[PDB]
């Protein structure tokens, strides 16, 4: 892929974070805390899952960013509508406003409904995410494997501004404490 030149600087929006997340001073890293992080509740926060949005909103053009997932057992990454549901239980699907992939129990899957098995030969340590708003495309790239394609959502119906989307996952096992990190340009 030759998408690197649409690189955008993403930062995390603290106000949207689940109340157990810890976001670094530079707003470029997030991890699961071992308790409530002593913040007030608000209508933006994801209540049920360890999710957070990027601050940036995109309604046109081409955008690219990279995320470090080193040594995590579980995570979701992609984009979502600015208007997605924050409270209660929901599935990651395009019908609900999400264009995502994930790692869960040693399998990588795309968030179609129902979900799609991904065929990854080299477990990724960094993921590239490309959005073409006008074309209706979200693509995922394996930066560890020379940028190989992971998955393309095409014919996307965004139906609103898009935000970068992250889920650090639960840490029931004690093996998933590591952060998601936004990688330097
Ligand atoms: C890895 C983990 C943090 N993900 C939580 C959110 N998630 C879903 O909502 C779905 C699962 C099956 C259909 S949708 C995908 C898995």
UniProtKB/Swiss-Prot annotation:
Biological processes annotated in GO: negative regulation of innate immune response; negative regulation of NF-kappaB transcription factor activity; negative regulation of protein deubiquitination; positive regulation of autophagy; positive regulation of cell cycle; positive regulation of protein binding; protein autoubiquitination; protein destabilization
Superkingdom, natural source: Eukaryota
Keyword vocabulary terms for this entry: Cell cycle, Coiled coil, Cytoplasm, Cytoplasmic vesicle, DNA-binding, Metal-binding, Nucleus, Ribonucleoprotein, RNA-binding, Transferase, Ubl conjugation, Ubl conjugation pathway, Zinc, Zinc-finger
Compartments, as annotated in UniProt: Cytoplasm; Cytoplasmic vesicle, Autophagosome; Nucleus; Cytoplasm, P-body
Post-translational modification: Autoubiquitinated; does not lead to its proteasomal degradation. Deubiquitinated by USP4; leading to its stabilization. Autoubiquitinated.
Keyword Cell cycle on entry: yes
The keyword Transcription is annotated on this UniProt entry: no
Signal peptide positions (record): none
Complexes and interactors: Homotrimer. Component of a SCF(SKP2)-like complex containing CUL1, SKP1, TRIM21 and SKP2. Interacts with CALR, CUL1, FBXW11, HSPA5, IKBKB, IRF3, SKP1 and VCP. Interacts with SKP2; the interaction with SKP2 does not depend on an intact F-box domain. Interacts (via N-terminus and C-terminus) with DCP2 (via N-terminus and C-terminus). Interacts (via C-terminus) with IRF8 (via C-terminus). Interacts with ULK1, BECN1 and with ATG8 family members, including GABARAP, GABARAPL1, GABARAPL2 and MAP1LC3C/LC3C. Interacts with TRIM21 and SQSTM1/sequestosome 1. Interacts with IRF3.
General function of this protein: E3 ubiquitin-protein ligase whose activity is dependent on E2 enzymes, UBE2D1, UBE2D2, UBE2E1 and UBE2E2. Forms a ubiquitin ligase complex in cooperation with the E2 UBE2D2 that is used not only for the ubiquitination of USP4 and IKBKB but also for its self-ubiquitination. Component of cullin-RING-based SCF (SKP1-CUL1-F-box protein) E3 ubiquitin-protein ligase complexes such as SCF(SKP2)-like complexes. A TRIM21-containing SCF(SKP2)-like complex is shown to mediate ubiquitination of CDKN1B ('Thr-187' phosphorylated-form), thereby promoting its degradation by the proteasome.
Protein name (Swiss-Prot/TrEMBL): E3 ubiquitin-protein ligase TRIM21
Species of the source: Mus musculus (Mouse)
Primary gene name: Trim21
């Amino acid at each position: 892929h030759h998408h690197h030149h649409h690189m955008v600087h993403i930062t995390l929006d603290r106000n949207t974070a689940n109340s157990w997340l810890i976001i670094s001073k530079d707003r470029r890293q997030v991890r699961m805390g071992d308790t409530h992080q002593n913040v007030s509740d608000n209508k933006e926060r994801f209540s049920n899952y360890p999710m957070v949005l990027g601050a940036q909103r995109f309604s046109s053009g081409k955008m690219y960013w990279e995320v470090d997932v080193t040594q995590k057992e579980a995570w979701d990454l992609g984009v979502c509508r600015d208007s997605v549901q924050r409270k209660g239980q929901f599935s990651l699907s395009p019908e609900n406003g999400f264009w995502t992939i994930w790692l869960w129990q040693d399998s990588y899957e795309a968030g179609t409904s129902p979900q799609t098995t991904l065929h990854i030969q080299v477990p990724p340590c960094q993921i590239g995410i490309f959005v073409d708003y006008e074309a209706g495309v979200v693509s995922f790239y394996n930066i560890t494997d020379h940028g190989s394609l992971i998955y393309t959502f095409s014919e996307c119906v965004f139906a609103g501004p898009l935000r970068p989307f992250f889920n650090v996952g639960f840490n029931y096992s004690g093996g998933n404490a590591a952060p998601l990190k936004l990688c330097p340009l």
